Design a protein around this ligand. Structure first.
Ligand SMILES: CCCCCCCCCCCC(=O)OC[C@H](COP(=O)(O)OCC[N+](C)(C)C)OC(=O)CCCCCCCCCCC
Ligand SMILES: CCCCCCCCCCCC(=O)OC[C@H](COP(=O)(O)OCC[N+](C)(C)C)OC(=O)CCCCCCCCCCC
Ligand SMILES: CCCCCCCCCCCC(=O)OC[C@H](COP(=O)(O)OCC[N+](C)(C)C)OC(=O)CCCCCCCCCCC
Ligand SMILES: CCCCCCCCCCCC(=O)OC[C@H](COP(=O)(O)OCC[N+](C)(C)C)OC(=O)CCCCCCCCCCC
Ligand SMILES: CCCCCCCCCCCC(=O)OC[C@H](COP(=O)(O)OCC[N+](C)(C)C)OC(=O)CCCCCCCCCCC
Ligand SMILES: CCCCCCCCCCCC(=O)OC[C@H](COP(=O)(O)OCC[N+](C)(C)C)OC(=O)CCCCCCCCCCC
Ligand SMILES: CCCCCCCCCCCC(=O)OC[C@H](COP(=O)(O)OCC[N+](C)(C)C)OC(=O)CCCCCCCCCCC
Ligand SMILES: CCCCCCCCCCCC(=O)OC[C@H](COP(=O)(O)OCC[N+](C)(C)C)OC(=O)CCCCCCCCCCC
Ligand SMILES: CCCCCCCCCC(=O)OC[C@H](COP(=O)(O)OCC[N+](C)(C)C)OC(=O)CCCCCCCCC
Ligand SMILES: CCCCCCCCCC(=O)OC[C@H](COP(=O)(O)OCC[N+](C)(C)C)OC(=O)CCCCCCCCC
Ligand SMILES: CCCCCCCCCC(=O)OC[C@H](COP(=O)(O)OCC[N+](C)(C)C)OC(=O)CCCCCCCCC
Ligand SMILES: CCCCCCCCCC(=O)OC[C@H](COP(=O)(O)OCC[N+](C)(C)C)OC(=O)CCCCCCCCC
Ligand SMILES: CCCCCC(=O)OC[C@H](COP(=O)(O)OCC[N+](C)(C)C)OC(=O)CCCCC
Ligand SMILES: CCCCCC(=O)OC[C@H](COP(=O)(O)OCC[N+](C)(C)C)OC(=O)CCCCC
Ligand SMILES: CCCCCC(=O)OC[C@H](COP(=O)(O)OCC[N+](C)(C)C)OC(=O)CCCCC
Ligand SMILES: CCCCCC(=O)OC[C@H](COP(=O)(O)OCC[N+](C)(C)C)OC(=O)CCCCC
Ligand SMILES: CCCCCCCCCC
Ligand SMILES: CCCCCCCCCC
Ligand SMILES: [Cu+2]
Ligand SMILES: [Cu+2]
Ligand SMILES: [Cu+2]
Ligand SMILES: [Cu+2]
Ligand SMILES: [Cu+2]
Lengths: 382, 236, 241, 123, 51, 236, 52
């Protein structure tokens, strides 16, 4: 829910999420929903954002309405921050367990150490049941199975209440006698040296000795119980395995790209050159979580969120099949209400009027190619 | 008579109003309050902001102005019993100020913290900013200014001069309210991380220290209490 | 004035209760502001309660208000509970927010969002000031004790969260799994300022070294904030603005 | 001049230096950008310059070569992942107003010291 | 590199997206002069009133 | 007589000399003055530097020494009219100091700024350093020291002790001159960028603040003016 | 490899080998952008004649 407020150009050129899939749309408490897909780190990473040398695969949700059971970059679990390489494509997978009933907008996001959150597309997921049914069991290496919902809760409550009671007892011992005005007047009028007299010093010595003794004894007792402990596990994980994508056989040059102010459309002129040996057709333009589709070429069957999906939002002046070896120039219009709803038109406010996106080309046999485009985006007012 | 039941009202009004506010934000936090660009947010929280700002300005004007016009011109001809009653009324004002300071600087401030680890900010006017920056901070500012004005206009001890600890106690905690400019600037251009210990937040900290002038203020009020009605009993 | 000696005693008692309320809750507000914007992030999360940064930083930044309030209360009334009242107020405000907002509003579990314990250090600071009323002796010995007892005082709480777990092929403590499971959208893993190991550090020496560094820096901070509180205790009447 | 006039009039009326440091310094910080907007607004007209979007001021900086000061030295707003396009100027203005309160408070006493008339009986 | 001519002949035209062609040598110069002179006169008037 | 026409000369000498200097640098800025390793630079600017340094040392010695030997031994036996005349002469010295301070600290300093966005530095002795660091700064230092010495040696008010604001006003702006060491060090090893707001330049800023002691100096001169010749008229 | 195990004064011992910089370089260690090939010994009991 944090997008629509970030700069449009930086939403356009940080990270491109595609091939997203959600295993379920409606789940019960304790059930699992799996979010998969790929993300590409844009080569033209903005200078105001630190390079993703330390990045965390996070989930966008209103608090722990789900718990993150697992998360993978590549094929390996990533509970710590990771190092990503600019220009690479990674596949990810997040496993969530439903915890709180309701309708939640779940995003896949990436946090960068020096640039803030990069929020991917959000999908509404319904959770049914009761929060009282949620369980989070975990088996330790010491041979004990505990529930993370309430483990150590009583011990924490007890120790905090005990020390609070000790402090309250100290203050109350001193508060049985008159507190402020008589003591102030006694300290002012000559030496006081009467408001603190034995056995006050004995009581203070007892409090100090009892505090130190209780701390030492409690530490020793908490070492006998739980004799095996480890420090908090932390540290960025290098060696994230990226996807080894084949080199695209389509080359696209953005010769001038504009947009109307005001308006809900973006227009660009592309020179597409088709290498390889199969006729291709432009089927999709993805800019920032928004997919503009040409319905005559490609249809979405993955249940992409409807507000981010423009089924016929991509119009190509000449979208006839492009024979191999042939190059042509077309005018491409990406038009949808999403362009204004997600404030992609707010790029006119940005200090860097440049866009980036992904074009998906499909051949007759159905196999698709991903090409990346970026160009200056010029507003037009007249 | 001396200390009357204005103290019960002073505690209860803040308690009841802030419990209602907490219920309101617990109901409209999610579901009209997560998305700042939705039209339901504009009616459930932007309207809240506008109404609370207007009411705060009007209430501050009325309260401070009334306290100032009803100021005591003949402070010399004030009986010690009346001075004791006025000192207790000032202590009730200080109690209300302390309660408002608690609600603003501890409860809703750390509540903004809970929200900082659950959402991604969409603006400077998130549901928690409406309640913490623009409701509770102005409320305790109004209460503190009213307490200072009451002391200056009814207590002879606090007349004939502006008390330095009282001025610090009243103005420093106020300075947290313009320190919100540092917060938003320190979150947008500076530190994109939701760190709650970042130097961008030391502006609240520096002027949160100025509330330690409550000690000088309280010894001044103790001396004002012990002017004619010091006893006897005390020191005997 | 007052009618009799009994009435003056009753009036003084009423003043005591009201002024105690005022002191306590003004301290709660200001101290909570200072703490949550100087050590709050470590105090929020069990997976942030580490052996280097949490142990080092929390006592240093938290000894500020107890030093000032001690310098006022002990000097003016011989009341030896400035540190204790500061710490109890901070704990009350923290716990109210943790239970009603961290767990009430949002649904982060209490065993995940509990605060740190500070009463043992406050008690040491107060008793060492009362006995041997020297403020210098307090700043050297009591501040040392305040810095040193912090981690052992909290160990009975966080020790159960350090039990190792085999979690999907990786070694994690219980606190690490809490942080991994209960998603914090605003606070990712890298923001965590925790001990990560260096080429100049020893595994079973991190906590004591951090504790002693915190004790020395607490000596310094107590010394500075004693005089800060002395200034804040002034009763001057500027003849304007 | 508009900020200076605000600072002076707010000090004269309500002769409180504290009131000046809080309100007049706020006004000094807040009125800066609106005071300069009539001058720099014509320089912010968008231009299509060789395929890139530039304002008139950007083209001025590009054309009139400054050997000593390259483009990267320019400390200007570049956008962040935590910022809004139509909120940058007001947020900066309010931050400047608060920091101006602080700086006015400090420099009032600095000037007080500089106004001393002591005669040290040496060097 | 040798440059011949007069600096008075130099032109730097530019066409904006609003449909206006301006010369960068003197565009906005009069407006800048006017506003700065106006505010300077206001300040001088204040000081002179007190002087 | 009172205030004579030494004021006209005091303004005019600085104006004419600095207009000639500006014409000189406008002619020999380019064309013998861009390349520091060329032999024409050595005759048009290094010779300028050497000559100006020698003349500055000689002029400072002569002026300060003459002012010191011609100091008034019998300050007690000075008539109020003569004191008024000497106070006006001191005010003329202060006017000359203010004019020299303007020319040095504003005109030629920001002129060095224009040069910083047109050239790439070849040395610490660029044409603008010759004029700003080694001509105008020493000139205003000499004028300020002369004004201080004149006050101390002719005005009884400024005798019997060194005035602290006057000493600050005279020495702090002087401290910008040795601060040039920070400038060159702060440009070579530190910040290679031609930033004019870099911390390397705060040394001028810190000692540029010390010129605010002109206020204490001026109230001291006002009191010296109003010793015997306060009126009457004034305060009546 | 070590060329000698026992040497006389002024004699030379040569230490050779390979080192591989690990890909999973820990984040708490700066990348070896500036590294020095040193020798671990209790002071100059040897002098480093050469290092390659
Ligand atoms: C120091 C001076 C402080 C001045 C500012 C004080 C702020 C007051 C609240 C602003 C409300 C707003 O602005 O919002 C108005 C809201 C908008 O909600 P709605 O869309 O109508 O939905 C229905 C919302 N229910 C379910 C809450 C009704 O509705 C209202 O009419 C309700 C406002 C009631 C406020 C008075 C009760 C306060 C608690 C009782 C003890 C005092
Ligand atoms: C007369 C009494 C009633 C009005 C009272 C004022 C209420 C707010 C008005 C907002 C107007 C507007 O234009 O919004 C604000 C515009 C942005 O606008 P946007 O991008 O469309 O916001 C869309 C998102 N929403 C719907 C949530 C607004 O800039 C700003 O972010 C300004 C931020 C300033 C931060 C620092 C403030 C410090 C205050 C210190 C006090 C001592
Ligand atoms: C008046 C002052 C009172 C001070 C009371 C001190 C209580 C003693 C605690 C035992 C420490 C311990 O047991 O070892 C050190 C542990 C750290 O262990 P870890 O790295 O977490 O290992 C995890 C495995 N465990 C669970 C077995 C630990 O705790 C500390 O880092 C705090 C070190 C402070 C001790 C300093 C005392 C030295 C005397 C002071 C002299 C001037
Ligand atoms: C003014 C200075 C006075 C000094 C008084 C010293 C009293 C020590 C009390 C026993 C503590 C203990 O035994 O515990 C210390 C623990 C050990 O921690 P551990 O090994 O990590 O684990 C726990 C291992 N146990 C279970 C076996 C304890 O903490 C420390 O590492 C601190 C040790 C370094 C202390 C340096 C002090 C230097 C003083 C110099 C005086 C000239
Ligand atoms: C005594 C105090 C006097 C203050 C006078 C203020 C004049 C009002 C200016 C309108 C601002 C505006 O119009 O919007 C904000 C614009 C920024 O716009 P931009 O991002 O450049 O967009 C470019 C497109 N334009 C040309 C349409 C803008 O200017 C500013 O950032 C200055 C914001 C300061 C306003 C704070 C006023 C709030 C009340 C103060 C309460 C305590
Ligand atoms: C002591 C505090 C007193 C507060 C008094 C407020 C008076 C407001 C006057 C109207 C200004 C206006 O309407 O303009 C504000 C402009 C809007 O800017 P914009 O949306 O970018 O563009 C211009 C858009 N117009 C042309 C529609 C204006 O600047 C700002 O963003 C500042 C807005 C945030 C103000 C936060 C104040 C919080 C106060 C809290 C009190 C408890
Ligand atoms: C506080 C005490 C300050 C002491 C230092 C003052 C610096 C003086 C200038 C140094 C010159 C130098 O050094 O250079 C000597 C230059 C080198 O130029 P050139 O190669 O001969 O070419 C011909 C250059 N024309 C075209 C300028 C002649 O020629 C000269 O003979 C001319 C120097 C004239 C200086 C006297 C006039 C000053 C303006 C009138 C009002 C006072
Ligand atoms: C007796 C009266 C006449 C002499 C007066 C002094 C004039 C300068 C002499 C230069 C000698 C030399 O050797 O040049 C200077 C040599 C470098 O030499 P280079 O590389 O050959 O320079 C070739 C380029 N040129 C032709 C332009 C020179 O080092 C330096 O950069 C020294 C720099 C010091 C900077 C900080 C000074 C702070 C002063 C503070 C005062 C309070
Ligand atoms: C040279 C430095 C070595 C350490 C000494 C520093 C203490 C100095 C404090 C000071 O200035 O004196 C304050 C009190 C005065 O009380 P006295 O009336 O002198 O009491 C003497 C009897 N007594 C031994 C039980 C205390 O006396 C005390 O403060 C208490 C004295 C007993 C020492 C142990 C107290 C500290 C407990 C942790
Ligand atoms: C963040 C830093 C903490 C703030 C603490 C700084 C306090 C500085 C002390 C101070 O304010 O001095 C007041 C004088 C005005 O004096 P007068 O009004 O003549 O009062 C006569 C008695 N007195 C000279 C001792 C004050 O100087 C003045 O011109 C009046 C200014 C008073 C402003 C103090 C209010 C501080 C609130 C933040
Ligand atoms: C509790 C804080 C709320 C804000 C009040 C802070 C102002 C305090 C300043 C102060 O100490 O008093 C100085 C003057 C005294 O002049 P007086 O002779 O009291 O004039 C009263 C008639 N008047 C209402 C027209 C002013 O009185 C004034 O300063 C002017 C009073 C009128 C308020 C509006 C003036 C500010 C304009 C921007
Ligand atoms: C960059 C920081 C701004 C500089 C402001 C610092 C001024 C410090 C005040 C000061 O200089 O004290 C002078 C005393 C010598 O005293 P005396 O010469 O005995 O004068 C008797 C009266 N008096 C003690 C009040 C001065 O101490 C001395 O030993 C004489 C040293 C005087 C040096 C002050 C000149 C500062 C010019 C930069
Ligand atoms: C000293 C500060 C007390 C703060 C208590 C608080 O925040 O209460 C809200 C919370 C809300 O949780 P709950 O009681 O379950 O009621 C939920 C109603 N909403 C969601 C509107 C808060 O619990 C209560 O209302 C208990 C009443 C305590 C009176 C001092
Ligand atoms: C009283 C202690 C103040 C120490 C300041 C500090 O911790 O700053 C950290 C920050 C280092 O930035 P970093 O923590 O790496 O921020 C990462 C997130 N971004 C890159 C978005 C800012 O340094 C600065 O930018 C200068 C601070 C000036 C203080 C007056
Ligand atoms: C209050 C400071 C006045 C500074 C004026 C200045 O720098 O003048 C030089 C500039 C040089 O431009 P210009 O007049 O065209 O003559 C060029 C001669 N050079 C190139 C030697 C400067 O214009 C003048 O000489 C006008 C005379 C103003 C008398 C107060
Ligand atoms: C009163 C504010 C002072 C802040 C200092 C500052 O802005 O320094 C920036 C600089 C950061 O260097 P940077 O701006 O990246 O310089 C780029 C150009 N080089 C690399 C040639 C220096 O930090 C330092 O080197 C330490 C400064 C110590 C001040 C007492
Ligand atoms: C850094 C601590 C300085 C505290 C200032 C106290 C000044 C007291 C003057 C009476
Ligand atoms: C940082 C501002 C401190 C200004 C010093 C003023 C001292 C005045 C003493 C008479
Ligand atoms: Cu969402
Ligand atoms: Cu990409
Ligand atoms: Cu917030
Ligand atoms: Cu220069
Ligand atoms: Cu290896």
């Amino acid at each position: 829910h944090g997008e629509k407020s970030q700069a449009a150009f930086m939403r356009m050129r940080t990270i491109h999420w595609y091939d997203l899939s959600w295993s379920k749309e409606k789940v019960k408490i304790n059930e699992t929903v799996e979010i998969k897909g790929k993300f590409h780190v844009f080569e033209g990473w903005p200078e105001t954002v630190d390079e993703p040398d330390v990045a965390f695969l996070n989930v966008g949700m209103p608090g722990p309405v789900f718990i993150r059971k697992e998360s993978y970059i590549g094929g390996q679990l990533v509970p710590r921050s990771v190092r990503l390489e600019i220009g690479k494509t990674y596949d990810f997978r997040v496993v969530l367990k439903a915890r709180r009933p309701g309708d939640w907008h779940v995003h896949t996001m990436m946090n960068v150490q020096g640039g803030g959150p990069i929020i991917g597309p959000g999908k509404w997921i319904t959770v049914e049941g009761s929060m009282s049914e949620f369980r989070n069991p975990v088996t330790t290496l010491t041979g004990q199975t505990v529930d993370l919902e309430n483990y150590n809760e009583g011990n924490t409550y007890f120790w905090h209440a005990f020390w609070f009671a000790i402090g309250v007892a100290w203050i109350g011992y001193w508060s049985r006698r008159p507190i402020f005005i008589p003591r102030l007047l006694m300290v002012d009028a000559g030496r006081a040296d009467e408001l603190v007299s034995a056995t006050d010093r004995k009581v203070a010595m007892g409090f100090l000795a009892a505090t130190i003794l209780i701390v030492v004894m409690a530490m020793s007792s908490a070492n006998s119980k739980y004799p095996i402990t480890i420090p908090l596990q932390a540290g960025t994980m290098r060696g994230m395995k990226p996807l080894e994508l084949p080199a695209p056989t389509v080359s696209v040059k953005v010769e001038d790209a504009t947009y109307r102010v005001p308006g809900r459309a973006m227009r660009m002129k592309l020179t597409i050159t088709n290498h390889g040996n199969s006729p291709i057709r432009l089927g999709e333009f993805y800019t920032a979580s928004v997919r503009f589709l040409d319905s005559d070429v490609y249809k979405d069957t993955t249940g992409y969120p409807e507000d981010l999906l423009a089924e016929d939002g991509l119009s190509v002046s000449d979208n006839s099949p492009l024979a191999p070896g042939e190059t042509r120039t077309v005018d491409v219009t990406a038009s949808d209400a999403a362009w204004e709803v997600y404030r992609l038109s707010d790029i006119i406010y940005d200090p860097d009027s440049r866009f980036a996106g992904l074009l998906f080309f499909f051949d007759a046999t159905g196999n698709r190619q991903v090409v990346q485009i970026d160009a200056p985006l010029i507003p037009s007012f007249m | 008579l001396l200390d009357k039941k204005w103290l019960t009202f002073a505690l209860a009004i803040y308690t009841v109003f802030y419990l209602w506010v907490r219920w309101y934000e617990g109901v409209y936090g999610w579901s009209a309050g997560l998305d700042s660009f939705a039209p339901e947010f504009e009616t459930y929280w932007m309207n809240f902001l506008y109404t609370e700002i207007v009411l705060e300005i009007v209430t501050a004007s009325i309260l401070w102005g009334y306290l100032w016009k009803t100021r005591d011109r003949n402070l010399a001809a004030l009986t010690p019993r009346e001075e004791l009653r006025r000192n207790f009324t000032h202590l009730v004002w200080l109690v209300a100020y302390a309660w408002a300071i608690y609600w603003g600087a501890s409860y809703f401030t750390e509540q903004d913290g809970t929200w900082h680890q659950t959402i991604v900010r969409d603006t400077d006017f998130t549901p928690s900013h409406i309640i913490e920056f623009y409701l509770s901070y102005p409320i305790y500012i109004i209460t503190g200014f009213a307490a200072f004005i009451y002391a200056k206009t009814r207590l002879p001890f606090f007349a004939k001069g502006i008390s330095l600890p009282y001025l610090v106690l009243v103005v420093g905690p106020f300075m947290i309210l313009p320190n919100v400019g540092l917060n938003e600037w320190g979150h947008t251009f500076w530190f994109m991380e939701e760190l709650f210990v970042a130097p961008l937040h030391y502006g609240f900290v520096i002027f949160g220290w100025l509330a330690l002038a409550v000690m000088g203020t309280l010894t001044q009020t103790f001396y004002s209490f012990a002017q004619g009605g010091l006893g006897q009993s005390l020191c005997e | 004035a007052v009618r009799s000696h009994a009435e003056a005693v009753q009036v003084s008692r009423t003043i005591d209760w009201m002024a105690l309320f005022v002191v306590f809750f003004v301290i709660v507000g200001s101290y909570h502001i200072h703490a949550m914007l100087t050590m709050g992030d470590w105090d929020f999360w069990s997976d942030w309660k580490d052996r280097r940064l949490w142990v080092t930083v929390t006592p240093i930044v938290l000894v500020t208000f107890p030093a000032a309030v001690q310098s006022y209360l002990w000097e003016r009334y011989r009341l030896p509970w400035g540190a204790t009242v500061c710490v109890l107020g901070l704990l009350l405000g923290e716990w109210i927010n943790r239970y009603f907002n961290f767990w009430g509003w949002t649904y982060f579990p209490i065993n995940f969002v509990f605060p740190a314990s500070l009463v043992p250090g406050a008690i040491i600071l107060d008793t060492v000031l009362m006995l041997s009323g020297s403020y210098l002796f307090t700043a050297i010995v009591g501040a040392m004790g305040w810095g040193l007892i912090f981690y052992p005082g909290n160990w009975p709480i966080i020790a159960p969260l350090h039990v190792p777990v085999e979690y999907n092929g990786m070694l994690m403590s219980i606190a690490d799994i809490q942080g991994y499971n209960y998603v914090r959208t605003g606070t990712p893993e890298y923001i965590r300022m925790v001990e990560k190991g260096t080429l100049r550090t020893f595994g079973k020496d991190v906590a004591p070294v951090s504790a002693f560094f915190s004790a020395f820096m607490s000596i310094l901070i107590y010394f500075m904030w004693h005089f800060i509180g002395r200034w804040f205790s002034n009763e001057r009447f500027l003849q304007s603005t």
